[PDB]
Amino acid sequence: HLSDMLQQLHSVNASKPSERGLVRQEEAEDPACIPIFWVSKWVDYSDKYGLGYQLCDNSVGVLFNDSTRLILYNDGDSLQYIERDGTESYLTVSSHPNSLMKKITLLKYFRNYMSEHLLKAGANITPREGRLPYLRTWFRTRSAIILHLSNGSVQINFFQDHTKLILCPLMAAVTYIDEKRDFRTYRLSLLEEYGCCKELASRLRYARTMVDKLLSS
């Protein structure tokens, strides 16, 4: 759906959202389109293992350096192992699967690390109701970290001001978290009619540049 997202993002950037006479941004809000999932926190151990992160529902997952991923559901015991080729597998920790003990151990170490050292992004936001997605890929730039989920969502966490973007092409929407940590969701199509502000417009512009990168990989 990365291709569908380049469409929507262009249309709105192509309409000069903030280059309007009167900007009626609040009119573009769509409470129903609130995301189901988004990355709460993350730790970069790619130097030796991979990248750990937590989803807003408290589940945790990791993308290992060997291109395999492991997810631990919020029940604290259910798992989901995805091999490189995308081959999903559903298991249980308590089932004590020898082949995965080392990676389970590492997954819990990230969980413990994020649990005592990091804040939970979007803590003051109730997601709408919905399987669990996994991190497909990710990368950082001098100015932000981009996270691409298996459900098609793309998240961009900006370093400087801590502002965040959560884009979804199924709902064709975007949720913008500002520096006050205010949390809002707009329907791309509407932001094209009613317009939006200057800082939201440039961020969406940066997002198209990030989606381009995601497609060229």
Binding site: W42, Y45, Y113, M114, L118, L119, I145
Partner: peptide, 5 residues
């Protein structure tokens, strides 16, 4: 290592 906020 590098991490989120």
């Amino acid at each position: 290592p590098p991490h989120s906020t």
